[PDB]
Amino acid sequence: NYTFIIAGGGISGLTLADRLTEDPRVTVLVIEAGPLDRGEDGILVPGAFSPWLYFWPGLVSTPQAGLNNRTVDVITAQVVGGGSTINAMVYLRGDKDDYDSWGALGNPGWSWNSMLPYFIKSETFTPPSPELAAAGNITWDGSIRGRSGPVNYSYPNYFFPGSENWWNAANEVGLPPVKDPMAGSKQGVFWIPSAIDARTMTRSHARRNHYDRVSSRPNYHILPSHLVSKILFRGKQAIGVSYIPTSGGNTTTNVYASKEITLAAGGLGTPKILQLSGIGPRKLLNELGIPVISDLPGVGQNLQDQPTLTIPYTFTNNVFPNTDSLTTNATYNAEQRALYDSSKQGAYTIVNSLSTNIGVMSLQRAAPKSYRQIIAAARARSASLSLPPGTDPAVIRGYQAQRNAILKQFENPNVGVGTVHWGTGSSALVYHLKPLSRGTVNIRSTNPLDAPEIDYRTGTDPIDAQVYTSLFRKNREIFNAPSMRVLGPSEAAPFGANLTTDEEIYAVMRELINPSNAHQCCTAAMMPKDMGGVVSSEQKVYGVQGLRVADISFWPFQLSGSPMATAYAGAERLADVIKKEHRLA
Numbered sequence: 001n002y003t004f005i006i007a008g009g010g011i012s013g014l015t016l017a018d019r020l021t022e023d024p025r026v027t028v029l030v031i032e033a034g035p036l037d038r039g040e041d042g043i044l045v046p047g048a049f050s051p052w053l054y055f056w057p058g059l060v061s062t063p064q065a066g067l068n069n070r071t072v073d074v075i076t077a078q079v080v081g082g083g084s085t086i087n088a089m090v091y092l093r094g095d096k097d098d099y100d101s102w103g104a105l106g107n108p109g110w111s112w113n114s115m116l117p118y119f120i121k122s123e124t125f126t127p128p129s130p131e132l133a134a135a136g137n138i139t140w141d142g143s144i145r146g147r148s149g150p151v152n153y154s155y156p157n158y159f160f161p162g163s164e165n166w167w168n169a170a171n172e173v174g175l176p177p178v179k180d181p182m183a184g185s186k187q188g189v190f191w192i193p194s195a196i197d198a199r200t201m202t203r204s205h206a207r208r209n210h211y212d213r214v215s216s217r218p219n220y221h222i223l224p225s226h227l228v229s230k231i232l233f234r235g236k237q238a239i240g241v242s243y244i245p246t247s248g249g250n251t252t253t254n255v256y257a258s259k260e261i262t263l264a265a266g267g268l269g270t271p272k273i274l275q276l277s278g279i280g281p282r283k284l285l286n287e288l289g290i291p292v293i294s295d296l297p298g299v300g301q302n303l304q305d306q307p308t309l310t311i312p313y314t315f316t317n318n319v320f321p322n323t324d325s326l327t328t329n330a331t332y333n334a335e336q337r338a339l340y341d342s343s344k345q346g347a348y349t350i351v352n353s354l355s356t357n358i359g360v361m362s363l364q365r366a367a368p369k370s371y372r373q374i375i376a377a378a379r380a381r382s383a384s385l386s387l388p389p390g391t392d393p394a395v396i397r398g399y400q401a402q403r404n405a406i407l408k409q410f411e412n413p414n415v416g417v418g419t420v421h422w423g424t425g426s427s428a429l430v431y432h433l434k435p436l437s438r439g440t441v442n443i444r445s446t447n448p449l450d451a452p453e454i455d456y457r458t459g460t461d462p463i464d465a466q467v468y469t470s471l472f473r474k475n476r477e478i479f480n481a482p483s484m485r486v487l488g489p490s491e492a493a494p495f496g497a498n499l500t501t502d503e504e505i506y507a508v509m510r511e512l513i514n515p516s517n518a519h520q521c522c523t524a525a526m527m528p529k530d531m532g533g534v535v536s537s538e539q540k541v542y543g544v545q546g547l548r549v550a551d552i553s554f555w556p557f558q559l560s561g562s563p564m565a566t567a568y569a570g571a572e573r574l575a576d577v578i579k580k581e582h583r584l585a
Ligand SMILES: Cc1cc2c(cc1C)N(C[C@H](O)[C@H](O)[C@H](O)COP(=O)(O)OP(=O)(O)OC[C@H]1O[C@@H](n3cnc4c(N)ncnc43)[C@H](O)[C@@H]1O)c1[nH]c(=O)[nH]c(=O)c1N2
Pocket: 007, 008, 009, 010, 011, 012, 013, 031, 032, 033, 034, 051, 075, 076, 077, 078, 079, 080, 081, 082, 083, 084, 086, 087, 088, 089, 090, 091, 092, 226, 227, 228, 229, 264, 265, 266, 267, 268, 269, 270, 273, 517, 518, 519, 520, 550, 551, 552, 553, 562, 563, 564, 565, 567
């Protein structure tokens, strides 16, 4: 009755819905758990950034065994536009070998070269002004940035003066300027590309660039505030879905698609839809009494995120203004907001608490004297030790293949494993990009309103702590370099210069690391079925027809970088794949 139904209206879902409805004879229904955002300042204006407005409620982890059994709040979006509506707008591609690796795992048609036309098609880059480029060391390669696609991205039109100290200090400790971190490599420091529309200096989220932009189309239907609770089958053909009010009224509705159902419900939502619908590990489905439609042990396995560490600092001589001027100086805040309201200049074009530059580093850039020892320990250890005993052997094989790919990335000088950032205020950020740990997301019941069990298993693979500790020490080098030392920084408790051994440093880290940057992925992974995969290289769920996974649940493993740009470009690629099979215009 509709041509396609898309479960979830986040980055992937709206991108696909937009491209599919380019054909007037194709109708699409997008069912999205959250509401339409209201254009409020906390969404549209970078300096007013209020992500908590649309956090999915009531998600907590299990006790995290690698993190002193801490339990954490789980953060993921529940709103039209998905993560793009509430994210920090950091817009970065992965490195070349991220995509080549995915190909090499048994995914034909996947590589950096085949993703690049979709990176370019997805976006419009707007250059900064020349005085800001020159004063800020902003550089890019226009040949590999898109000029005509829907996602607008650019930069803030302002930087805090402390960001200069950090840039030079990063340079002094071996993180050089990167010509363009969108070119497939990002070893060193560079300006963060920001998913902002430069004509108004406001967020360019998928609600706007892949729904509002084309909302006059009568064939592009949206239904906010409803949950897809089940896929409906005729035999092994996915023919429709059931949905309920997100607010949990006792009502259920069935709707039907004439070609395909697409899952786009995110790393933490798509596996739950599959499992509720009989697609997942038969042991789980059997104990819940769910008839097995397709026995896929990979469903809900292989969860990954990019762990984060916030390090507190004090300063004897920080420079003014800085980002914390916005919270501690009511006059400075008022004058910056007035500046933004009048001529759209100033601090409010930067996402609140962030700065303008950032650094990414390979394992050997982070640990030049000991990276070979970390690789040896990771190579020596059987991949199966990172998974609970009795993990399905096919899942174990797929993880083994991921792990071998990542160990070659550890050896590669041009693939990132970590990110460092200083917002110019009282804390720095260190991101662990490529954990070897793997978690799980599993339904607890047949009740579609029940949260799944979410176990990140952060730090369970002991190599991760070795990588992360090195990332910590490189951040410490930045702050001790000459250009930062003029600002007189010192680590505050619970860190501090008196922690000098790995054990001392990681003990604190074990208490402070957050499992998650809200980058949850890889829980319906695109790997061969005998490697524990859930979707083919065309993103079709094994064992059933007319059913695909579009959201980043399908990624084999995490990028050298944050996921947003690839979430867009991957849905761009899938839209073409689907149009080809069904002869769509
Ligand atoms: C606070 C915060 C901050 C950041 C980020 C996330 C968050 C939450 N990210 C992560 C990035 O935004 C994220 O990985 C992508 O948005 C995920 O894209 P998907 O399309 O896979 O899911 P996404 O999460 O965008 O969409 C999934 C959608 O499905 C809906 N849904 C789930 N279950 C459903 C069901 N049963 N029925 C219907 N709808 C359902 C949800 O409501 C949601 O809107 C990020 N990335 C980056 O590159 N740079 C950044 O700065 C940040 N920062």
